[PDB]
Design a protein around this motif. Structure first.
Motif, short mmCIF file in Angstrom:
data_model
loop_
_atom_site.label_atom_id
_atom_site.label_comp_id
_atom_site.label_asym_id
_atom_site.label_seq_id
_atom_site.Cartn_x
_atom_site.Cartn_y
_atom_site.Cartn_z
N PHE B 171 -160.65 37.17 -3.64
CA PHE B 171 -161.66 36.21 -4.06
C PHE B 171 -160.94 34.91 -4.45
O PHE B 171 -160.01 34.52 -3.75
CB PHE B 171 -162.57 36.82 -5.13
N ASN B 172 -161.35 34.21 -5.52
CA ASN B 172 -160.88 32.83 -5.71
C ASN B 172 -159.58 32.82 -6.51
O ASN B 172 -159.60 32.86 -7.74
CB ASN B 172 -161.97 32.00 -6.37
N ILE B 173 -158.45 32.74 -5.80
CA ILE B 173 -157.13 32.76 -6.45
C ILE B 173 -156.78 31.35 -6.91
O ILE B 173 -157.14 30.37 -6.26
CB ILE B 173 -156.06 33.31 -5.48
N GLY B 186 -158.79 24.48 -3.52
CA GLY B 186 -159.49 25.21 -4.57
C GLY B 186 -159.97 24.28 -5.67
O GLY B 186 -159.28 23.31 -6.00
N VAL B 187 -161.16 24.55 -6.22
CA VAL B 187 -161.75 23.64 -7.20
C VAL B 187 -160.88 23.55 -8.45
O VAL B 187 -160.80 22.49 -9.08
CB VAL B 187 -163.19 24.06 -7.53
N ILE B 188 -160.22 24.64 -8.82
CA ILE B 188 -159.39 24.61 -10.02
C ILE B 188 -158.18 23.72 -9.80
O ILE B 188 -157.82 22.92 -10.68
CB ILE B 188 -159.00 26.04 -10.44
N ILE B 201 -163.39 13.54 -11.78
CA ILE B 201 -163.63 14.62 -10.84
C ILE B 201 -164.99 14.40 -10.20
O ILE B 201 -165.83 13.65 -10.69
CB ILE B 201 -163.55 16.01 -11.49
N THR B 202 -165.22 15.06 -9.07
CA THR B 202 -166.53 15.07 -8.45
C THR B 202 -167.05 16.49 -8.48
O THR B 202 -166.35 17.42 -8.05
CB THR B 202 -166.49 14.53 -7.02
N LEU B 203 -168.25 16.66 -9.01
CA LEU B 203 -168.93 17.94 -9.02
C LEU B 203 -169.98 17.92 -7.91
O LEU B 203 -170.85 17.04 -7.89
CB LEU B 203 -169.56 18.19 -10.39
N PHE B 204 -169.89 18.87 -6.99
CA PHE B 204 -170.85 18.98 -5.89
C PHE B 204 -171.95 19.95 -6.31
O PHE B 204 -171.78 21.17 -6.24
CB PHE B 204 -170.15 19.43 -4.61
N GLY B 205 -173.08 19.40 -6.75
CA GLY B 205 -174.16 20.21 -7.28
C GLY B 205 -174.26 20.11 -8.79
O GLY B 205 -173.69 19.22 -9.42
N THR B 210 -171.16 29.87 -9.84
CA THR B 210 -170.21 30.77 -10.48
C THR B 210 -169.22 31.32 -9.46
O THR B 210 -169.56 31.54 -8.29
CB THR B 210 -170.93 31.93 -11.19
N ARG B 211 -167.99 31.55 -9.92
CA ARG B 211 -166.96 32.12 -9.07
C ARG B 211 -166.18 33.17 -9.86
O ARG B 211 -166.09 33.12 -11.08
CB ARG B 211 -166.00 31.04 -8.54
N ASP B 212 -165.59 34.10 -9.12
CA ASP B 212 -164.75 35.16 -9.66
C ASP B 212 -163.30 34.71 -9.46
O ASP B 212 -162.69 35.00 -8.43
CB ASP B 212 -165.07 36.47 -8.94
N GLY B 272 -174.03 25.12 2.94
CA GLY B 272 -173.53 26.48 3.05
C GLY B 272 -172.88 27.03 1.80
O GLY B 272 -172.47 28.20 1.80
N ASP B 273 -172.78 26.23 0.74
CA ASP B 273 -172.13 26.68 -0.49
C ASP B 273 -172.79 27.95 -1.00
O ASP B 273 -174.02 28.09 -0.95
CB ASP B 273 -172.22 25.56 -1.53
N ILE B 274 -171.99 28.90 -1.46
CA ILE B 274 -172.53 30.05 -2.17
C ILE B 274 -172.70 29.65 -3.63
O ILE B 274 -171.77 29.12 -4.25
CB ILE B 274 -171.62 31.28 -2.02
C1 LIG Z 1 -160.09 27.04 -1.66
C2 LIG Z 1 -160.77 28.26 -1.08
O1 LIG Z 1 -160.21 29.35 -1.06
N1 LIG Z 1 -162.01 28.11 -0.60
C3 LIG Z 1 -162.68 29.23 -0.03
C4 LIG Z 1 -163.79 29.72 -0.92
O2 LIG Z 1 -164.65 28.65 -1.16
P1 LIG Z 1 -165.33 28.54 -2.57
O3 LIG Z 1 -166.56 27.68 -2.50
O4 LIG Z 1 -165.74 29.90 -3.11
O5 LIG Z 1 -164.24 27.88 -3.49
P2 LIG Z 1 -163.91 26.35 -3.75
O6 LIG Z 1 -162.69 26.30 -4.65
O7 LIG Z 1 -163.64 25.70 -2.41
O8 LIG Z 1 -165.16 25.65 -4.40
C5 LIG Z 1 -165.88 26.27 -5.43
C6 LIG Z 1 -166.99 25.38 -5.85
O9 LIG Z 1 -166.48 24.13 -6.39
C7 LIG Z 1 -167.11 23.04 -5.74
N2 LIG Z 1 -166.27 21.92 -5.74
C8 LIG Z 1 -165.11 21.97 -5.06
C9 LIG Z 1 -164.25 20.88 -5.04
C10 LIG Z 1 -164.71 19.68 -5.85
O10 LIG Z 1 -164.00 18.70 -5.89
N3 LIG Z 1 -165.85 19.66 -6.53
C11 LIG Z 1 -166.64 20.78 -6.49
O11 LIG Z 1 -167.69 20.77 -7.10
C12 LIG Z 1 -167.44 23.53 -4.38
O12 LIG Z 1 -168.55 22.82 -3.77
C13 LIG Z 1 -167.84 24.98 -4.65
O13 LIG Z 1 -169.23 25.02 -5.10
O14 LIG Z 1 -164.49 30.79 -0.31
C14 LIG Z 1 -165.03 30.57 0.99
C15 LIG Z 1 -165.51 31.91 1.52
O15 LIG Z 1 -166.68 32.31 0.84
C16 LIG Z 1 -163.97 30.03 1.93
O16 LIG Z 1 -163.02 31.03 2.23
C17 LIG Z 1 -163.28 28.83 1.29
O17 LIG Z 1 -162.28 28.32 2.14
#
Ligand SMILES: CC(=O)N[C@H]1[C@@H](OP(=O)(O)OP(=O)(O)OC[C@H]2O[C@@H](n3ccc(=O)[nH]c3=O)[C@H](O)[C@@H]2O)O[C@H](CO)[C@H](O)[C@@H]1O
Ligand SMILES: NC(=O)c1ccc[n+]([C@@H]2O[C@H](COP(=O)([O-])OP(=O)(O)OC[C@H]3O[C@@H](n4cnc5c(N)ncnc54)[C@H](O)[C@@H]3O)[C@@H](O)[C@H]2O)c1
Ligand SMILES: NC(=O)c1ccc[n+]([C@@H]2O[C@H](COP(=O)([O-])OP(=O)(O)OC[C@H]3O[C@@H](n4cnc5c(N)ncnc54)[C@H](O)[C@@H]3O)[C@@H](O)[C@H]2O)c1
Ligand SMILES: CC(=O)N[C@H]1[C@@H](OP(=O)(O)OP(=O)(O)OC[C@H]2O[C@@H](n3ccc(=O)[nH]c3=O)[C@H](O)[C@@H]2O)O[C@H](CO)[C@H](O)[C@@H]1O
Lengths: 308, 307
Positions: B171-173, B186-188, B201-205, B210-212, B272-274
């Motif tokens: 999941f989200n490493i 990665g958002v972190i 920073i920019t928050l999308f939404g 939530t993330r694990d 497509g965001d989860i």
């Molecule tokens: C980095 C990473 O491993 N991303 C993976 C992860 O996406 P994820 O969306 O689960 O992780 P993410 O780190 O890319 O983003 C998490 C959340 O933060 C949001 N966000 C991100 C950047 C920012 O500047 N501002 C902001 O608000 C982003 O829109 C999302 O809602 O899982 C997906 C599969 O389900 C895909 O495998 C993606 O490639």
């Protein structure tokens, strides 16, 4: 006149499709490497037919082959599952890369409609003994089966990302004239029919209670043409099985009766990878296609036998 | 004992390399340095051997596995979006490298391979539910289809050739060395770099997503156990903690760590965001020794302190 690219068009299912497309007035371009396909399967005298001999995973060939084509039917693959078990690297080129390269070529050329020969093998053993619905969990057990499933996933990606219009069909067990019986892993009906015609023994692996949902090739061809002509095909996959039940023992008796000759049945052990019971849930197929009255097993076996 | 780590110069890989060397293993890294960096590696360790090249290259892989007792296969183009832009090139890295490795392991008689699969194989099917390993699969990109195809091939080599795959769906490493250089990083890593630099920073939404999140050091522990466990299970294991962190939580936690306020621009929700993604990690808890994982605040402080 519209032109249809048919990869694998020189093979068993493809060449029957080619015959049917030409009769409907289409122009047809066959791409085939003649690995198991045969020029003798094609009506080379038909002015509407073109033949390209080459590899369907070859991007330069596909760039030439799609030019001037209005739609595609993607049948090229190494059909023998056992060949993929022996050489996963080589068969992955034919069983998946060819699909990927075709998607690239179709998107560049602007061609949307592609009918794809997927396979019941993507279910593996899941759902065995029940009518297998399309949303049954997948369990591909061989490189062939995983490559057909991967092909579905990529086709769906090009649908959503690039506007491709895939028609994904999961064939169950197809039989009929021109199915090649020369391998020990050829389709059982082509093997049994070839032996019966020659008056030689067949070999039954296991007790004969195994069941298959057999489809005569002419009924599959009707479905393939409808896939090319439908106005807005569904995005998700459709089983092509009839939902019928035929044991190998049913098949042996029906074939022996049609041949009019005695049939010796030798025995071998159950095959290692053998699924005992396989049957399609035909509901999506009956909703999405006009099947008419499909050929029964006996009718299909008779047509096969009378052709040799 | 020598461990082959494909992708060992990257984010997760280099932290794994550190841990394996510290435990007394000799470690061989195979990495093409597309995103990995030699600066992530403790070069001149004397137990570390670096090969530079393509993990899909058959002749290089045959050399790389020779004399190795086990493999951790982390090499891939990690960016989902690069797979969208170039399916053909990324399929070589994201699937062919797995197939070639299976071939090279079988020829050399090496059984144990720990594999980095991904929560992306579930598509959007995990929305709003604890995501178990039998959650229906819906790989939406070439990257996700390639990870899942790698899983299926690994299982075929297990049954047909005696391979021992340890399939782990990450999941989200997050943590130190995770490249924050892309908008899709990665958002972190992105929020932390901006907070340290004092930039908006920019928050999308709305930030309710939530993330694990899993700190890299806890994942590394799982990877090592995958190498050393005596009889690992055949099917996949989700690597998450079953934790629930909103992005608004993450912003508040980073503000408290950095000591400065974070300016937050408002962006639209990514297509497509989860919204809600959480692993059901029962199989992880049963098959591995999780101990006490780092909390998010702990992992955030360790990351922030290293910037
Ligand atoms: C980095 C990473 O491993 N991303 C993976 C992860 O996406 P994820 O969306 O689960 O992780 P993410 O780190 O890319 O983003 C998490 C959340 O933060 C949001 N966000 C991100 C950047 C920012 O500047 N501002 C902001 O608000 C982003 O829109 C999302 O809602 O899982 C997906 C599969 O389900 C895909 O495998 C993606 O490639
Ligand atoms: N029971 C069945 O017949 C059945 C069941 C499920 C799926 N399918 C699928 O249906 C399609 C047609 O199978 P078939 O039964 O007619 O067998 P077939 O072997 O007669 O047809 C396969 C054709 O593809 C061609 N081909 C193979 N590799 C190629 C390549 N790399 N480049 C170009 N051409 C290539 C072969 O020459 C042959 O003409 C295949 O995709 C097969 O996997 C068939
Ligand atoms: N949240 C996450 O970080 C996350 C989530 C799910 C899966 N994963 C998987 O974990 C593994 C490591 O990802 P990461 O976060 O450390 O990113 P990363 O980009 O830092 O690590 C990937 C490494 O693989 C190397 N590499 C890429 N293509 C290669 C090739 N063809 N041959 C050889 N080396 C190649 C790169 O140079 C890099 O060092 C990847 O397989 C990734 O898909 C990561
Ligand atoms: C998809 O693959 P299938 O196994 O469904 O197709 P297939 O035609 O290869 O096999 C059908 C069945 O017939 C059996 N079989 C096949 C060939 C033969 O000479 N004798 C025989 O009994 C075979 O073990 C299987 O149980």
């Amino acid at each position: 006149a519209e032109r249809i690219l048919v990869t694998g068009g020189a093979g068993f299912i493809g060449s029957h499709l080619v015959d049917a497309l030409l009769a409907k007035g289409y122009a047809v371009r066959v791409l085939d490497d003649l690995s198991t396909g045969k020029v003798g399967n094609l009506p080379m005298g038909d002015a509407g037919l073109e033949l390209l001999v080459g590899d369907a995973a070859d991007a330069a060939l596909l760039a030439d082959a799609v030019q001037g084509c209005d739609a595609v039917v993607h049948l090229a693959a190494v059909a023998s599952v056992q060949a993929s078990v022996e050489d996963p690297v080589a068969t992955h080129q034919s069983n998946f890369i060819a699909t990927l390269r075709l998607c690239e070529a179709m998107t560049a050329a602007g061609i949307r409609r592609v009918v794809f020969a997927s396979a019941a093998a993507v279910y593996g053993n899941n759902g065995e003994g029940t009518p297998i619905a399309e949303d049954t969990p997948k369990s591909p057990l061989t490189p062939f089966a995983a490559d057909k499933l991967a092909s579905e996933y990529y086709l769906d990606f090009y649908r959503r990302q690039h506007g491709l219009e895939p028609v994904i069909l999961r064939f169950f067990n197809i039989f009929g004239p021109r199915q090649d019986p020369s391998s020990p892993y050829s389709g059982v009906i082509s093997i049994f029919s070839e032996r019966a015609k020659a008056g030689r023994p067949i070999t039954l692996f296991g007790d004969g209670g195994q069941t298959r949902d057999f489809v005569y090739v002419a009924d599959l061809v009707k479905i393939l043409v409808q896939g090319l002509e439908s106005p807005a095909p569904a995005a998700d996959a459709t089983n092509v099985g009839l939902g019928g039940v035929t044991t190998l023992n049913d098949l042996i008796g029906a074939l022996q009766q049609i041949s009019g000759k005695p049939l010796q049945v030798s025995h071998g052990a159950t095959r290692s990878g053998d699924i005992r019971h396989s049957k399609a849930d035909n509901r999506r197929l009956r909703e999405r296609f006009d099947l008419g009255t499909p050929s029964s097993l006996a009718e299909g076996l008779e047509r096969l036998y009378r052709s040799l």
